[PDB]
Amino acid sequence: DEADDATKKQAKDTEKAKAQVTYSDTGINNANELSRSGNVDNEGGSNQK
Amino acid sequence: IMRVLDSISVLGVKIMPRAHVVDSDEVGEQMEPTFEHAVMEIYKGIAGVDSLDDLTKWVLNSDLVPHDDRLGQLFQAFLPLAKDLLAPMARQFYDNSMSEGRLLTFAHADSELLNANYFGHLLRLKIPYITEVNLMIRKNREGGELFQLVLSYLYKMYATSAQPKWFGSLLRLLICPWLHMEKLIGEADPASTSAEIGWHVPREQLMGFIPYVSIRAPRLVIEELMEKNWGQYHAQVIVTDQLVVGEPRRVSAKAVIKGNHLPVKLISRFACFTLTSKYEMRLTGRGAAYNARLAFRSD
Amino acid sequence: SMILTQFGPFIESISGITDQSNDVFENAAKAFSMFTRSDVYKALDEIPFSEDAMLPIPPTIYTKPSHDSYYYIDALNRVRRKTYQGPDDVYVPNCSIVELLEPHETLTSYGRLSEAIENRAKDGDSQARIATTYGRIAESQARQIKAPLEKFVLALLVAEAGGSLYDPVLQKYDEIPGLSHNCPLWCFREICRHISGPLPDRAPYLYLSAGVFWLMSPRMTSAIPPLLSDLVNLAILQQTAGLDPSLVRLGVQICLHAAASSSYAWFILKTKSIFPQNTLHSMYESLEGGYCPNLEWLEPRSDYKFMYMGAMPLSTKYARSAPSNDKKARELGEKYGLSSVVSELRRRTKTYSKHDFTSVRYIRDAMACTSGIFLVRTPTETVLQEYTQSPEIKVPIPQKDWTGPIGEIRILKDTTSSIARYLYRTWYLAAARMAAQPRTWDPLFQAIMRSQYVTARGGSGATLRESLYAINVSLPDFKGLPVKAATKIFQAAQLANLPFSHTSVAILADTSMGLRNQVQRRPRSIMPLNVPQQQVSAPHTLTADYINYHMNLSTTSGSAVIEKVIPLGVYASSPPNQSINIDISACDASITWDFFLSVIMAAIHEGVASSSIGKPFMGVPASIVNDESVVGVRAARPISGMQNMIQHLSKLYKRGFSYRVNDSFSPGNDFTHMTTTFPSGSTATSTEHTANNSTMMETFLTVWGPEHTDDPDVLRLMKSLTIQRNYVCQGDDGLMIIDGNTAGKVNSETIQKMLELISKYGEEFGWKYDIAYDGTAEYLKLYFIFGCRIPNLSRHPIVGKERANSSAEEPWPAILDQIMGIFFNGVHDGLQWQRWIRYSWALCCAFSRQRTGYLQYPMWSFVYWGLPLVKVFGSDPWIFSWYMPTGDLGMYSWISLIRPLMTRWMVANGYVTDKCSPVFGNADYRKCFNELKLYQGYYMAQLPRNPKKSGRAAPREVREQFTQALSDYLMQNPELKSRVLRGRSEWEKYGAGIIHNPPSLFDVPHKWYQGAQEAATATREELAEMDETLMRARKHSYSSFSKLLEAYLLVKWRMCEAREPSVDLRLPLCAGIDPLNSDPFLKMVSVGPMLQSTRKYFAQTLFMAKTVSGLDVNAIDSALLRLRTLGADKKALTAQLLMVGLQESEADALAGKIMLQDVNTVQLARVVNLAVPDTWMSLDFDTMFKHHVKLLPKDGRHLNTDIPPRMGWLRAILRFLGAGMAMTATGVAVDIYLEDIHGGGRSLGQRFMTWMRQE
RNA sequence: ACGAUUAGC
RNA sequence: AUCGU
């Protein structure tokens, strides 16, 4: 979702319906990518509480 | 150009005074928000701008050349206003102006006249001068000068794709033929040469001549004009008003042509005339509708 | 019970109870003729209704305001209606009318519009003008019915007095509730009772020829006259289609709510998608079974080659994946106070979960329950509402992307960043490929295309003469002769000698107006352009024809459901391959000079430049026009005739159009109007509309689409489909096909995103696509779900007829033709066959008598017109179907079917003759037929049903100069005249009158003169002559039939074995046809539907593709085939083809080809005047004509059915002779074998030849 | 002096 | 769209 938001921001910066340069249509498989979020604590648990 | 054309006279007529002419801003000036004020409040609904000056900065770069993407985006907001807030009022005003006389109308864009169903001859005219610098030198045109530049660009792109003829054609048509008439019959007798055409309401209409065109020509030309049948040209005349303040007692009339219109070759090619004229009845009481016809009176 | 007492024998005759004879028919017709309206309403009151027939009636229909507060006078002294709900509230108000009535003489209780108000409006009063405009508009609204409504009501009463009807196939009575459950009829009775009140008269209004009279009463309003017709339509549909009571009650509720609202027409226009959107758009939310056709249409695409391969069961995963249509439906139901009806419909729809016959019938009933009336409004308001809208172009073509003007055209440089480049390229290539392609220079082609628009119909000639006299050029006038002076033929005669330079002024003339109403849709205004204005737009329509013929996948289909692309809808509606309905809103005002015309004129202009230098086109000389193309220098650039055409058309399109409006419903409402909308009624309109639609969809699918999308799946979908494979466009509407992949059907979300993209894309150049994604298919007003057609009953009203002006209605034979058309429309829509036949016979009897003396049409004439008959001569009732061929073939079919019983019946009662006849034997068929009036009806049915106002006396030498003018106009190129003169020379040399009337180009002026004289009002003497002709035909006695019928009766056939089924019996192909409707179901299952478009199949038969207007291609081909069969030298055919205008070499080659080749049955059939009836054209008749009709008897050669090797064309005639019998009988279509020919094959051929040597 | 005026397919 | 008024 964060790469998609970056793509939308680039589209707005370019002022077109679709940005020529995209971060989501890449043909490379990148399923193992992890981005930092507030789901995990430092100890390794989840911030359910 | 209006000021110059106002002070033009050759024979005992006025060619184009400060009348019979509708200004381009006059179509949209008579509204509670004017069209200029309406398009001033367009920065709302556009991201990154909060004021008219901010909009002008955002749409115009340092070069003062329009940025194609931003101006194209802004036209998508400008056009709905020009197609919903202006067009009906423009159509009503143009129809009303056409009803109460034959007038020359000035407009900013071709689509402005086309979308209002203007009933008249359409002429596209351009001047040699650069208009943008003229806008940049002019001041106090109800807002920022950069706003005037952007608004002019918007009207330009709003217009359709058609080749505009030069202003010289219309200006020559308006001015030049009369000078030849001054050369020819300026020495001649005024009453002998003078003639006019207008609607003829019958005398037996209890409560009249309403001129339509005026022709100044040599005596032979008008004598040729006389026997031409000014028939099968009917109109409905509604003439009720208080006196138009004037040199002679004269009330204003409203005539609408139902049949055909006057062919210029039916009039002449050897005789000049006037392009625009207002409608007013030559003489009180109330008014009504009378189906009148044309007539040609002279001395 | 008075109906029974006064009609006893007639019901038993037409209900299959007793025999159907002529005396009973004539007595019933006389009783229909003498039956007062008050007696009709008394018999109506005698009906013992029940509950379930009663629906509450609001009290506010009667109490309505006046009309003054609804109209006003604006500037320019025009009358128009002020709007209260948006800009569409311009229809007829529902206000009262009582205070505008003055009693008519000779009857006190009726009145019309007062002449005092008429005069006070004529001399200039405002309120009087408003009142008379309202009165005339209400008159026009009330005058939208074919005939007085009481006749239809009484015919329904008589027809339904018979009760339930036995079914020969189903072997049981039909369970349909009687008239006691008819809700609309009860509502009609209640409304009439409440309006009538204490007054003895009961008719709310009486409908005369010109004008109607209103029964004055305080409860009378203006919404009654459409409401009554609506209720009668609903009642007739319920009785003749087996509509369930609940849906009809909902429809009546909707109609009453519409009447109680501010404007009936406005409310019914606002609510016109209640039933189709709640029922058709929401079924099959959860499927468990059913069968759908497994269609597959071949890779040759422009030919529409469709193949049918069984039926496959419906899986559960083929549910309704389209987005739900709940929110907007509920909101619309809440807005207009129709929440209960919408809720009922939505709850009822969800109970159908299997694609059986019942769900399709429920859909048909729901679509039939909508209100079908002809909406009407003042012309000055439809003009002001339709011709003032302009397109909204958000990204116009940049100014820098053009060049200097080539006269009045600027070529668009191919370096543009706008989307118009691809449109310009497509049109440029189309124009070039036209100009290089050589048939556009043969003089016959130019003559045909110049005579396309020359038609005996109005073309605004007054404006033409005014504009052309404005330059002091005088045109001849013709006085004293009875031709119409307001038709385009008159203009063509007036514009004969004049060159193009003088007539070029008339191109910029002001077009006159036109108007016509339509069912559940706003009326359309039409502007007919004068003859030179049609002429000047020839390259546009021609290159549009080229585009629509080669570049795209499209069709130019015909008017009726039979001549339409039904297969494509069946294929596009199948569950594996869902489809999208694309419609363009207001396409007339869409294209203007800003974008579309600006690109198109330049594309055409430089398309033809480097292909045709000089060589002037039809009647337009080449000319010279400068250009400022490159930098500063300007050339002279000589142009061809077509480019002068383009220059004139370009000035016309750039300036716009002037539209004179001089109506009659509002006095003092004449004016002019300048509009920018593309003209409707021009030659080029539909072709260019379809071409532009296809080109814009293609460029979207190619370039614009991928440039504005992000998701991968939608891109994969968009790269997969192209307009050449799956897109079919005709004019305004269109249809796109999305085929199923291996994993089922394409995901709905991708389609929704793509539709959003289409909506965004269309607004860039001023288009608003009306896109519906509902899982069904719509095209040319045809509705399909899961490969099953659904006829929209309400779109074809039974009592409705559109009338724009205030002209009086045509005489009685015209209403006879209209009743026959109503019966045929009922046939195509699939009603309950027994009940529909009975009701059609009831109307037949009702409208069969007219006084002047009295004139009557014997039943047999109506049978000859194509209406099937129930039970005669003591045979079995309900034995003949309505697939009966109309005409002579039809008589033969039923007579040969029932002959051995006819002879027995004749002999059994006083008809015996010692002479033996080969057809009927020893029965005096002559005296019997003369007494039964069968000969009289058969011969009278052939007489014309319009007054013979053609041929009226004309002073001489005036008609002569007229005909000379048309002759000069038709043939301006000398070489074509030389061809015609040659053809006549070798025709005199060789033809020698073998055929009496060979078509030729010199007789075109005569036919044009007759047609132009035909479109005129007929004096009383013409009608008197017509009635005298009918009386003389009735009184006369005829010895025998026509030659063709006697020749047909010599052929005997035999029916051994039924065909094996061609369609699965569990597959619903169309609504209305099911086991409850035995005859159409069995006929379609045994024969099979036509899976090929009829237009191309019929086109491939003709020898010559097209001919000049005023001549018939069928006539030319019939003459050619007669000259083959009657022996004639080849030279005769060459002379005939030369007389048609074909070139000598091509005529010789075609004659040589024709001499020896054989042709399919259709063309050979035409030789004796036989064509496939319009009823059969919905079935697959070709396979039956080819295979399942065998000329060889089932037991070998009989030495009597020996067709000679000469006159081998007899096989086609025999094929139809057998097929008529095979199709007339009810039940399964049966294989039919030839049995015997009495006189022998050579004798029968000699009879046909001696008939051919006639006419 | 007013009046029974219209498409294309 | 003038003889219908």
With beta carbons less than 8 A apart as the criterion, state whether C998 and C1126 touch.
no
β-strands C1230-1237, C1189-1190 pairing: parallel
Give the C-alpha separation, C1128 to C1252, whole Å: 13
Experimental method: cryo-EM
**Which candidate in A5, A8, A16, A18 is best for mutational testing of the C interface (most C CBs within 10 A)?**
A18
Instruction: List Cβ neighbours of C254 (8 Å cut-off, separation of 6 or more).
Output: C271, C274, C338, C341, C371
∠ CA B117-B119-B122, nearest 5°, is 95
Q: Give C1124's strand partners.
A: none
**Contact assignment for B73 to A16 by CB distance below 8 Å:** no
Question: What Å value separates CA C706 and C1' D1?
Answer: 70
For nucleotide D2, give the residue with the nearest CA to its C1'. Answer: C122
Protein-strand E interface by C-beta, 7 A: C 462, 486, 662
Residues from chain A contacting residue B69 (CB–CB below 8 Å): 15-16
- Considering only CA atoms, which of C884, C885, C860, C865 is closest in space to residue C813? C865
Q: At C910, list the tokens.
A: 């006083």
Question: Where are the strands (E) in C922-963, listed by range?
Answer: none
Resolution of this model in Å is 3.4
Per-residue DSSP letters for C523-559? Answer: EEE--PPPHHHHHTTHHHHHHHHHIIIIIS-B----S
Indicate yes or no: strand D within 7 A of the C-beta of C834: no
Query: What is the C-alpha to C-alpha distance for residues C1134 and C1145, in angstroms, rounded to an integer?
Result: 9
C821 CB contacts (<8 Å, ≥6 apart)?
A: none
Cα separation of the two ends of chain B: 35
Q: After which residues is chain B broken (C to N over 2.5 A)?
A: 207, 283
Helix (H, G, I), strand (E, B) or coil at C1053: strand
In this structure, are residues C444 and C728 in contact, taking their beta carbons and an 8 Å threshold?
A: no
Which chain B residue shows the shortest CA-CA distance from A12?
Answer: B47
At position B291, the amino acid (one-letter code) is N
Residues in chain A closer than 8 A to C712 (CB atoms): 25
Contact C594 B288 (CB under 8 A): no
Instruction: Report the C-alpha gap between C753 and C737 in whole angstroms.
Output: 16
State whether residue C712 sits within 8 Å of chain A by CB. Answer: yes
CA of C122 to C1' of D2 (A): 10
- Checking each nucleotide's C1' against the CA of C557, the nearest proves to be D9
What subunits touch chain A, counting only 3 or more CB pairs under 8 A?
B, C
- The H or E element that residue C771 is part of is strand C769-772
Instruction: Give how far C82 is from chain B: nearest CA, Å.
Output: 15
Direct distance between the N- and C-terminal alpha carbons of chain A, in angstroms, rounded to an integer: 24
SS3 C1237: strand
Contact assessment for residue C1092 and residue C567, using Cβ atoms and an 8 Å cutoff: yes
What is the token pair recorded at C65?
Answer: 């305001």
Distance B260 CA to E1 C1' (A): 16
Evaluated on CA atoms C502, C507, C510, C511, the torsion sign reads: positive
Phi, psi for B32 (deg, rounded to 5): -60, -55
Strand partners, C1111: none
Distance, Å, C1019 CA → E4 C1': 14
**B200 CA → D2 C1’, Å:** 20
- Measured CA to CA in angstroms, residue C341 lies from C238, C252, C701, C1046 at distances of 19, 11, 41, 60
Q: Does B162 touch chain C (CB under 8 A)?
A: yes
Are C737 and C726 a contacting pair, CB within 8 Å? yes
C244, with CB counted inside 10 A (0-12, 13-18, 19+), is middle
Q: Where are the alpha helices (DSSP H) in C1157-1196?
A: 1161-1166, 1181-1186
- Would you state the structure tokens that stand for residue C464, as one six-digit string? 């033409």
Q: Which amino acid is at C621?
A: P
Angle C319-C323-C328 from CA coordinates, rounded to 5°: 130
> Can you say how many angstroms the Cα of residue C59 is from the centroid of all Cα atoms in its chain?
40
Distance from C-alpha of C37 to C-alpha of C952, rounded to nearest angstrom: 39
Q: Measured between CB atoms, does A1 come within 8 Å of chain B?
A: no
Q: CB–CB of B175/B8 below 8 Å?
A: yes
| Tokens linked to C677 | 């909308």
Q: Measuring CA to CA, which residue among C169, C933, C1095, C1154 is closest to residue C567? A: C1095
Helix residue ranges per DSSP H, C167-289: 183-196, 224-241, 245-260, 264-270, 275
Cβ-based contacts of A16 with chain B (< 8 Å): 69
Task: Give the C-alpha separation, C37 to C960, whole Å.
Answer: 53
> CA of C72: how far to CAs of C81, C129, C131, C137, C313, in Å?
6, 10, 11, 15, 63
**C92 within 8 A of C137, measured Cβ to Cβ:** yes
- Shortest distance, CA C706 to any CA of chain A (angstroms): 9
Q: Which long-range contacts (CB under 8 A, 24 or more apart) does C300-304 make?
A: C301/C553, C301/C724, C301/C725, C302/C553, C303/C1096, C304/C555, C304/C565, C304/C567, C304/C568, C304/C1092, C304/C1093, C304/C1096
Which residues in C lie closer than 8 A to residue B95 (C-beta atoms)?
Answer: 75-76
Closest CA to C980 of C1111, C1101, C1157, C1127: C1111
